[PDB]
Amino acid sequence: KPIEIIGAPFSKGQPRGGVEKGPAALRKAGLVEKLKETEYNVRDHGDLAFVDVPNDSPFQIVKNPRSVGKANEQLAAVVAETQKNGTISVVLGGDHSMAIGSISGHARVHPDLCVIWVDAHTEINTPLTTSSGNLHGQPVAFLLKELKGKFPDVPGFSWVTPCISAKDIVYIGLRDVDPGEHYIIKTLGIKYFSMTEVDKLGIGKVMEETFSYLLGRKKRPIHLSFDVDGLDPVFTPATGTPVVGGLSYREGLYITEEIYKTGLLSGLDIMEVNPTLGKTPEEVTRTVNTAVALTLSCFGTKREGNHKPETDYL
Amino acid sequence: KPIEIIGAPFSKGQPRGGVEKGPAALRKAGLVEKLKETEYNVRDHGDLAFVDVPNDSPFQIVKNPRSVGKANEQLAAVVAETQKNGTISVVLGGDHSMAIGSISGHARVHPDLCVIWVDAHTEINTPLTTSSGNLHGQPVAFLLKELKGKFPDVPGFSWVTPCISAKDIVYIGLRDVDPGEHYIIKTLGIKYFSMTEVDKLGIGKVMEETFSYLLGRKKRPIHLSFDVDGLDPVFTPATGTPVVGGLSYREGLYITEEIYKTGLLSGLDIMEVNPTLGKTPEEVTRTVNTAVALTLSCFGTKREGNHKPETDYL
Amino acid sequence: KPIEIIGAPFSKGQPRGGVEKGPAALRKAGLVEKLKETEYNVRDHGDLAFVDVPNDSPFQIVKNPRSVGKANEQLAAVVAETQKNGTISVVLGGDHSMAIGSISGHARVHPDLCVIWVDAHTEINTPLTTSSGNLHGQPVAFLLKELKGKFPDVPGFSWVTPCISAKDIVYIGLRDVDPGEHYIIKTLGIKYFSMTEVDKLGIGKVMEETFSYLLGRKKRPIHLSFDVDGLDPVFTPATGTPVVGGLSYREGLYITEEIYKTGLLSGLDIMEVNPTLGKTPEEVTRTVNTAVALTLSCFGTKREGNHKPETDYL
Ligand SMILES: [Mn+2]
Ligand SMILES: [Mn+2]
Ligand SMILES: [Mn+2]
Ligand SMILES: [Mn+2]
Ligand SMILES: [Mn+2]
Ligand SMILES: [Mn+2]
C-alpha cells in the first residue's frame, strides 16, 4: 500500500505563530526516511503553498476566515486526489483547522469513513460559541451534518459540504472542553472517552469499545486526526495548547498500534506540532520524536519488534 | 447545595513549619472563586484563630498535645455548626491532625458517615507506637472506637469521642506504613487499597469496590479526608512527607469525580499543603494547582466538560 | 533464608565506562544495611576482582570476548558455590553480560530454574547478528539451548553450557528490539510481554500469566535478571541504553512484590546501573534509590507496610 505525505504549513487557525514550521521539523527528524523502512511505498508530495487572502477582515469574532477557508479548499483538493488513486494520505500540520480540508477531501472518495479524534479538546466550537475567533478550535463544527445551518455561513467556507454525522466520530483524550462544546457533544450524543473514561477503563478496553462502536456493523476506512496535545505536556510540550493530565507516551503508541492492526487506516493527521514553543531544544526534540513515533506506529512499527518476511535471519 | 470553606492554619501536628500557610496559598490561587462558578452556593467562613497553649509540655513522646487538642476542639465545634445547617464543609489544612476535629464535628451531626482517606500514610499510630511524637501521624487512632483505651488519655483530647469504627473507613494510596500501624490495620481488619492494589486493580475497579464496601448496605454521607501526599511528589511536591510511587494526577481526579457522582459528599479535607517546602516557585504552584483541581472536582468539574442547564448555546 | 551479595565490577560488555562503579553506588546507598532489617540473613561476599586479558583481539565484530568470557567463568564459579550452600544470590552489576555467569552458575545447582528477564531489550543478539560487537546485548544467546551451534564458538566462552531452553524464559518490558532478535524470539516461540502487552493487560494480569506459564506445571526456583533500563528513563536515567515509554516505578515494584510472594526467588541481578551517566547528581540518586527499592522489594518490603511477627505493638 501507498503512503503520500502532504505538508500543511498553516497557522492562521490560531494566534501563536510557529505551527507552520511543524512539517519541516518532522521531515528534519527523518520522518520520510524512517517511513521508507516500513513495508509501505512512500511518496513525499511536498508542502502546499498557501496563498494569503489580503484584507481578510474578521467575520464577527472569527479571525482569518477567508485565509483558512481557502487553504483548506486547496488541501481538500489535494487529499481527494491522492485518495482517488488509492493511496493513504498523511497530513503534517500546522494547526488543527486543516482537518477541515483533510477530512473533506478524504470523504469525497470515501463517504462512509469514520473519524477517531485524539485531542485534549473537542474543537467543535461553532462561530457563535467561540470565546476567541480561533478556527483551530472549530474544525468539527464545519464537518458535522447535525450542525448544518446552526451557525452563519462564514467567508471562505461555502465549498465545505458537511460530510460526517455525529455517529461517525469518536473522541479520545478529552480533558479541556468549553461549556458550549460540552453542550453540543451531550446534545448530539457524540461518543467520547475523556481522560476519566481512560482512567476508569484502561487504554486497552477504550480502543476495544471505539472499534465495536465505529466498526461493529460495517467495516469502513478510518481517518485518524491526531492532535499532539492529546498527550501529556511531559511528552509533547511544544504545542500551543498544553493541558496537564493527558495520554501517556505508552497509551499514544498503544492506540496507533491498534489502529494499524485494523488494516483500515485510510487517512492520518499529525497536527499542532509547534517547534517555536519549546522552552529548551530538548523539549522540541521530545515533541518531534514522539510525533514521528506515532506516525511510524500507525504503520506497523511494533514495540515488540519487526522482522522482514521471507528472511531467515539464521 | 451549600458549601462552607473553613481554614485551619495549624501546624503543631508535626515538625515542619509552613502548613499553616496552606489555606492562604489555596485562596491565593482563586479556590473560593472558581468554586463559585460551580452549581454550588459558596460561603467562606474565614480562617480560625487558634489560641496557643503556653507551657505545652510533651506527654511522654507526643508533642504539643494541648495545643493540638484545643485547636481540634475548636474546629469540631465550627464543623458541627455548619453541618447542622445542612451545608457541605470544606476544611483547608494545615497538617492532617486537624482531621480529628473535622471528622468529630461532622460525626456529631451525621453519626452514620463513612470515611475515605486518601494518603500515602495510614496515620493511625497511637501515642504508644509513634517513633516521633508527631500528631499528624496519629489522627485515626483518636477516632477509632476499636482503639478506645488502648492508649493513655492525652492532655487536651478528653473531649474527643471515638465516632467511627473500623468498618467505616477505607484507605487509598497507602505506601509508607510503620510496623505498628500495619499491625493495627491487619488486626482490626480495616479495608485499604495500597499502591499495590491500585496497580493490580486499576483506579477504576478500586473505586467500585470502596463504594460497594462502604455503601453496599446503607447509603450514608461521605467524609473525604485528602492528604495531598497521596499523590506522587511529581504532582504535589510541596508536602512534608513525600513518598515516591504514588497516585497520578489522573487517578486523583478520577477519585474525586467518582465521589462527586455518588451525590453523598458531606465533608472534605484538603490537608498537608506546605507552601514553604517547594524547591522552586513552580513546585509550589504545581502543588496548589492540583489541590484546587481536586477540590473543584469534588464538586462537579468534569474532565469531559461542564455546561449550564437550560442554556441553549446554539 | 540466606542472602549473599556478590559485586560484579564489569564493564567490557559494552562501550560506556562507568557500570563497574554500579556496585559501589548501590552499597554506598545502604543496600546491605537496609537489606539487613528484613527477615533474611545477609552476607556480603564483596566485589570480585576480574583479571584483564591482555591482547584481547576482537572476534570478528565481538569486542573483548576473552575478558568477558573469563570474568563470567569466575562469576559462575562463585554463584555455583553460594547456591550450593542453599543461599540466595544477588549479583550487583556492571553490564548485563554478567548474566551469563550468574545464570550459568545458578543452573549448575538448580538445573530446573526459569528466568524472568526485565529489560527494554531482549539481548539475545548472536555474535553473527550484532550491529555492534557489544556482549551486553548478547547474554541470552549464549544461554539458550536452541541457539547452540547457530553461531561460531567465541574465544573465552568454551566453558559455557547452554542451560535453559526457550520454554524457560519470559521477557517483560520489551520496547527496543533489533530485527534479528525479533526474528529469533518469534522463531523460537519465546514468551514475552512488550510494553504493548503491558499496556493492553495491566501489570497485574501480566504477572498472573508469566507465573501460570513458567510455574503452571512444576514449581521451580526463579532467577530474576533485572536490567534497570526496563523502567522508564524518568525513574532510572543513569543507564547506558535508555528507551522512553517503559515500566513505571509502581509497575517495577509490583513485579518484585509478586515475585517475593511466590517464595521461589533463588537468584537476582541488578544490572546496568551506571553512576557516571547521570546528568545531575539527582539523576544518579534517583536511579540508585529505585534499584535499592526493587531489591528490598524482592525480599519482602511491602508498600502496604511490614511488621515483625510476635511483636505486640500495643
Ligand atoms: Mn487541541
Ligand atoms: Mn485539535
Ligand atoms: Mn501523609
Ligand atoms: Mn495524612
Ligand atoms: Mn538493556
Ligand atoms: Mn540487559
Side-chain angles (χ1 to χ4, degrees), chain B residues 96 119-121 123 227 229 241 272:
Chain B
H96 216 168
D119 203 333
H121 320 89
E123 317 194 359
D227 181 331
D229 64 32
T241 310
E272 302 285 12

XYZ file of all heavy atoms in Angstrom, chain B residues 96 119-121 123 227 229 241 272, ligand 3:
75
model
N -2.472 17.210 58.819
C -3.554 16.250 58.948
C -4.125 15.966 60.351
O -5.141 15.279 60.475
C -3.145 14.948 58.253
C -4.292 14.256 57.577
N -4.127 13.213 56.692
C -5.629 14.463 57.658
C -5.305 12.807 56.257
N -6.235 13.549 56.828
N -4.229 8.992 51.257
C -2.970 9.351 51.863
C -1.952 8.283 51.493
O -2.311 7.187 51.039
C -3.192 9.347 53.370
C -2.205 10.204 54.136
O -1.088 10.379 53.614
O -2.523 10.708 55.228
N -0.676 8.589 51.671
C 0.365 7.599 51.397
C 0.573 6.896 52.719
O 1.166 5.820 52.759
C 1.652 8.286 50.974
N 0.052 7.524 53.779
C 0.161 7.003 55.132
C -1.169 6.667 55.733
O -2.200 7.176 55.292
C 0.803 8.035 56.039
C 1.939 8.769 55.393
N 1.758 9.928 54.671
C 3.264 8.482 55.325
C 2.922 10.329 54.194
N 3.853 9.470 54.575
N -1.652 6.786 59.318
C -1.729 7.803 60.342
C -2.746 7.382 61.375
O -3.735 8.043 61.675
C -1.967 9.123 59.650
C -1.056 9.176 58.439
C -0.899 10.516 57.818
O -1.524 11.472 58.312
O -0.146 10.627 56.822
N -5.112 13.691 51.977
C -3.724 14.096 52.304
C -3.053 14.220 50.925
O -2.855 13.263 50.215
C -2.909 13.015 53.171
C -1.484 13.497 53.503
O -0.874 14.287 52.742
O -0.984 13.067 54.558
N -0.230 14.355 50.029
C 0.918 13.500 49.737
C 0.494 12.141 49.217
O 1.325 11.254 49.003
C 1.857 13.332 50.950
C 1.220 12.610 52.152
O 0.363 11.731 51.967
O 1.592 12.936 53.303
N 5.886 15.166 53.883
C 6.222 13.743 53.831
C 6.031 13.060 52.485
O 5.207 12.152 52.367
C 5.383 12.979 54.828
O 5.462 13.618 56.076
C 5.873 11.615 55.000
N -2.223 19.038 54.350
C -0.779 18.994 54.179
C -0.132 19.811 53.062
O 0.968 19.510 52.625
C -0.332 17.531 54.083
C -0.724 16.692 55.307
C 0.137 16.972 56.529
O 0.888 17.964 56.518
O 0.059 16.200 57.508
Mn 0.606 11.750 54.841
